[PDB]
């Protein structure tokens, strides 16, 4: 076999970067500050962090397994819960004590044949009284939300019509239902992409069929009332190259970034609209609505080159590390327009920024508040003399959030510092009364200067505040997405406003 | 109540010395180098670690709860697994979210009555199938090897006659016994020492009950074919102080190191000989054994101040931090003398050194290798510049171990370098055929340039060279004592030479 490396090398775990690979408990964390005592429910988030050095140089951050963080809150106590899903994955190679699963999304570079590639590592949401972590190659890894077992693979009681589950569901908050998708969703290179929901009894409701015009990646989608929208990053699989050896995804300079618009119910595969915005990169969607006119509102981060820059075009060609920003971006859809291009998009503010999270009670509706990570460049707000040699590289940086009023156009931004850096957000209604927006948010900090990890705890009134820091003697990993689940909610989810 | 500090203050809790408080597992750890394939079995070492801010300021870092760390070698490969003892502080604390317990063996200034107040933080020893975790005013824990679940607190069927059990039992390789005993036995500041042994079987074999000329804190003890030697730190208990509020220990000035002698088997308590050796500390015991003549020659680490200035005389009279050198001193002894008075030891080395070991498979025999920690004030073998500021406070300091052949009169000297420092080693025989102190020893480091600990595995043949360093993206706080179980011994102990 390759042979395998018995220590972490390279970049990707260099740093900040390295792996950790703890699993246990931290419970009484360290507070500068005061909680809330109010805040009663789970922060859950995932990253990537390898169990075993690849024997894959440079392996990619996305293709590291997945281990969950759970922050669980009460009367301003905080526990940590730290568990790697059992994927099959992780179980084999545990077994082994050697990594097997080679190139991303790639099993002609496999040492031994898996039924199931997820490394869990993208998402963690909850759903009926189960954690989901989400991997967009594969179904869902179902969890236990107070101890972080895994239960297994989970096919919602054998109604799963796909091979593949989203990282990006929505939940509803008016039908309780959640709403999914799966693109390459009968195997590798395939162009099909199946659409279906689940309400909130747990029995499926929509199930559509439908063709993407091309096999390419599709990481997040839009639902609104009466639509859900596909957007497709420009990124395209070709399983002839994968054989050889290749890569699953090479950008293509040559396409649109098509936006794919289907009605929500009742539909057959045919009724999809694949609509051609202006080549570039589809972010992720903070959320979609039908205005007045019955016009979709699409909000998204938008790039104008690829993102990925790691999997380049045919010729090698695509952009350097540091280079891309993407900004938060409108987009209007009418699916009963015949006319296939759009036009550019709108931007909502100048920041490069990622990571959206709106107030979850408006999802598919309109919404007026938006909180997001952003990357500022300009002298001071990070010391990169100081980061960068102590940051590895593989991740992206965050070294603000930014809460935006749509109403208004009022920006506050927090500054963590110049030596720290955020990961994605959370946002906390203050009770079940408060207003959309109106409440507490939550983000991973990563410390350089101690080389640490911290949870800031900020309230809405004044974002630029911390309420609480939260001090952690480890260092978390550079994650992906998390959630809040809240106590007083009994499904999970918040109410609608 | 006092209140309840919600995150860690002082210096006995600063730098590398701020606790982490992790509980679970890290398998496949990194290795650089080789571990050799043949070594299999289990390093098992106790740290203090405070789960919750102490309410107690500058609280000593012997007060701290016991955390156990189990590295589990087989094959070249090792996993780490970690977990807290469950004493009666750890739980009751746990359950309120605040310290209870008090200053260190002061049960007047506790906020809760306590039956146990053991931390379980000095030594984790194997002893029929069991862990014991031991803390010197208490009895055992008894602990999971496999798990490290907590069973209980362990009263031996209960045939434990004492209050108290040592942190510093000797297992006998000849006969099998655990050879034992507990001073202030029958409580807070009584001069009772009871000394007793176990067989292999687990029956309780001598209980002697015997009296001490002073209140004095026996740590450690010494074990020969037919003798047991008490060496008594002028550390002294007077409980009327304690009721006021005052330390558990001061030192007196006044008094010799009485080194008591009794017959191993068979004794009555009148028949202890209280020989007094030149004022000064009684550090860990290396070995006794009797030499041709019936002498005991009694080997251990000897001072001629209080190295816990911080428990000084009445008046406040003591040493400061890093004055105080501990020598690796032979005492001779003739339990027919009646001459009470000793001669001052002679030196083995000149070297500050502390926790010695032996080849545990001559001990109460005569030994002729000793392991030890050494702190080497020659200039540039430790960066005092760089690892004070990040040492924090309240442990000692080792900078390498050495290891005296007393044959040769030959010594080895490991340096980890000049910006770490290590704990106490362990000796594992190469294998049951070994000559003595022929095999491996193992050292955790403190690395202060990462912040990480480190575990160093060497091969005696040569001590200056690691053969593997496996590498720990956490830090282990500075611990005490530590045990090697070997997985080709069937009761967890080697064969006698
Ligand atoms: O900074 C960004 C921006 C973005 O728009 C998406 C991502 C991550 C996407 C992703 C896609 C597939 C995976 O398997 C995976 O681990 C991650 C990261
Ligand atoms: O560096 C040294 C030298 C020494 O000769 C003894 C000790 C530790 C003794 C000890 C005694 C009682 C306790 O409760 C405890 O945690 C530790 C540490
Ligand atoms: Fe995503
Ligand atoms: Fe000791």
Redesign the interface.
């Given at each position: 076999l390759p042979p395998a490396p018995?220590?972490?090398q390279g970049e990707n775990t260099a740093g900040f970067m390295?792996?950790?690979?703890?699993?246990?408990?931290?419970?009484?964390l360290?507070?500068?500050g005061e909680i809330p005592k109010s805040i009663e429910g789970t922060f859950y988030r995932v990253m990537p962090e390898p169990?075993?050095?690849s024997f894959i140089p440079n392996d990619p951050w996305f293709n590291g397994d997945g281990n969950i963080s759970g922050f669980y809150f009460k009367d301003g106590?905080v526990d940590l819960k730290?568990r790697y899903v059992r994927t099959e994955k992780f179980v084999r190679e545990?077994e082994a004590?050697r990594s097997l699963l080679g190139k991303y999304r790639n099993r002609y570079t496999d040492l031994v044949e898996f039924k199931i590639r997820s490394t869990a590592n993208v998402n963690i949401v909850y759903w009926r009284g189960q954690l989901l972590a989400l991997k967009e190659d594969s179904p869902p890894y179902a969890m236990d939300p107070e101890t972080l077992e895994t239960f297994g693979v989970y096919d919602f009681d054998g109604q799963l019509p796909s091979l593949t589950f989203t990282a990006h569901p929505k939940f509803d908050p008016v039908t309780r239902e959640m709403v999914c998708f799966g693109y390459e969703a009968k195997g590798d290179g395939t162009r099909d992409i199946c659409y279906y929901s689940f309400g909130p009894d747990g029995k499926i409701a929509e199930t559509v069929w439908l063709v993407s015009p091309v096999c390419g990646m599709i990481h997040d989608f839009a639902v609104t009332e009466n639509f859900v929208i596909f957007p497709i990053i420009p990124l395209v699989c070709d399983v002839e190259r994968m054989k050889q050896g290749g890569d699953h995804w090479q950008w293509d300079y040559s396409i649109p970034m098509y936006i794919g618009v289907l009605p929500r119910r009742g539909a057959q595969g045919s009724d999809v609209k694949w609509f051609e915005a202006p080549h570039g990169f589809a972010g992720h969607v903070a959320n979609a609505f039908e205005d007045d006119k019955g016009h979709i509102q699409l909000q998204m981060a938008y790039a104008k080159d690829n993102v990925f820059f790691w999997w380049p075009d045919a010729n090698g060609k695509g952009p350097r590390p540091g280079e891309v920003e993407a900004h938060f971006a409108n987009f209007v859809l009418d699916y009963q327009s015949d006319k296939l291009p759009l036009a550019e998009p709108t931007y909502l503010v100048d920041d490069d920024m990622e990571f959206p999270r709106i107030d979850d009670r408006v999802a598919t509706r309109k919404h007026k508040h938006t909180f997001f990570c952003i990357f500022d460049r300009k002298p001071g707000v990070t010391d990169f003399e100081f980061v960068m040699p102590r940051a590895g590289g593989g991740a992206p940086m965050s070294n603000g959030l930014a809460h935006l009023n749509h109403e208004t156009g009022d920006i506050q931004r927090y500054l963590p510092g110049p030596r720290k850096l955020t990961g994605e957000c959370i946002f906390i209604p203050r009770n079940s009364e408060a207003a959309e927006g109106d409440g507490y948010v939550m983000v991973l900090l990563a410390n350089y200067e101690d080389?640490c990890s911290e949870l800031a705890v900020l309230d809405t009134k004044d974002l630029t505040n911390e309420v609480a820091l939260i001090?952690l003697?480890?260092?978390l990993r550079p994650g992906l997405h998390g959630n809040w689940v809240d106590k007083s909610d009994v499904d999970g989810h918040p109410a609608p406003l």
């Amino acid at each position: 076999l390759p042979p395998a490396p018995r220590y972490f090398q390279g970049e990707n775990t260099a740093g900040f970067m390295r792996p950790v690979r703890f699993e246990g408990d931290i419970t009484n964390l360290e507070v500068v500050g005061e909680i809330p005592k109010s805040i009663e429910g789970t922060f859950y988030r995932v990253m990537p962090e390898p169990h075993l050095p690849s024997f894959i140089p440079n392996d990619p951050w996305f293709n590291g397994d997945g281990n969950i963080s759970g922050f669980y809150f009460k009367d301003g106590h905080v526990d940590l819960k730290q568990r790697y899903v059992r994927t099959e994955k992780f179980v084999r190679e545990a077994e082994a004590r050697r990594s097997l699963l080679g190139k991303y999304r790639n099993r002609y570079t496999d040492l031994v044949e898996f039924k199931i590639r997820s490394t869990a590592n993208v998402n963690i949401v909850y759903w009926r009284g189960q954690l989901l972590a989400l991997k967009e190659d594969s179904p869902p890894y179902a969890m236990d939300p107070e101890t972080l077992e895994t239960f297994g693979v989970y096919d919602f009681d054998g109604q799963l019509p796909s091979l593949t589950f989203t990282a990006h569901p929505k939940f509803d908050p008016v039908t309780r239902e959640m709403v999914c998708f799966g693109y390459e969703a009968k195997g590798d290179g395939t162009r099909d992409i199946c659409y279906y929901s689940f309400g909130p009894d747990g029995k499926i409701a929509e199930t559509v069929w439908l063709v993407s015009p091309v096999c390419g990646m599709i990481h997040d989608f839009a639902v609104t009332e009466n639509f859900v929208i596909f957007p497709i990053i420009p990124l395209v699989c070709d399983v002839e190259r994968m054989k050889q050896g290749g890569d699953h995804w090479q950008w293509d300079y040559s396409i649109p970034m098509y936006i794919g618009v289907l009605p929500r119910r009742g539909a057959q595969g045919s009724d999809v609209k694949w609509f051609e915005a202006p080549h570039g990169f589809a972010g992720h969607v903070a959320n979609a609505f039908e205005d007045d006119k019955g016009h979709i509102q699409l909000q998204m981060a938008y790039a104008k080159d690829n993102v990925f820059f790691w999997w380049p075009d045919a010729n090698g060609k695509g952009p350097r590390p540091g280079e891309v920003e993407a900004h938060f971006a409108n987009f209007v859809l009418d699916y009963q327009s015949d006319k296939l291009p759009l036009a550019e998009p709108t931007y909502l503010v100048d920041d490069d920024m990622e990571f959206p999270r709106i107030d979850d009670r408006v999802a598919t509706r309109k919404h007026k508040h938006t909180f997001f990570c952003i990357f500022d460049r300009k002298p001071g707000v990070t010391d990169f003399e100081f980061v960068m040699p102590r940051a590895g590289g593989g991740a992206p940086m965050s070294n603000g959030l930014a809460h935006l009023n749509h109403e208004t156009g009022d920006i506050q931004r927090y500054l963590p510092g110049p030596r720290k850096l955020t990961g994605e957000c959370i946002f906390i209604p203050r009770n079940s009364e408060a207003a959309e927006g109106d409440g507490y948010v939550m983000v991973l900090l990563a410390n350089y200067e101690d080389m640490c990890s911290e949870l800031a705890v900020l309230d809405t009134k004044d974002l630029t505040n911390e309420v609480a820091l939260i001090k952690l003697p480890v260092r978390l990993r550079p994650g992906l997405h998390g959630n809040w689940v809240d106590k007083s909610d009994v499904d999970g989810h918040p109410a609608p406003l």
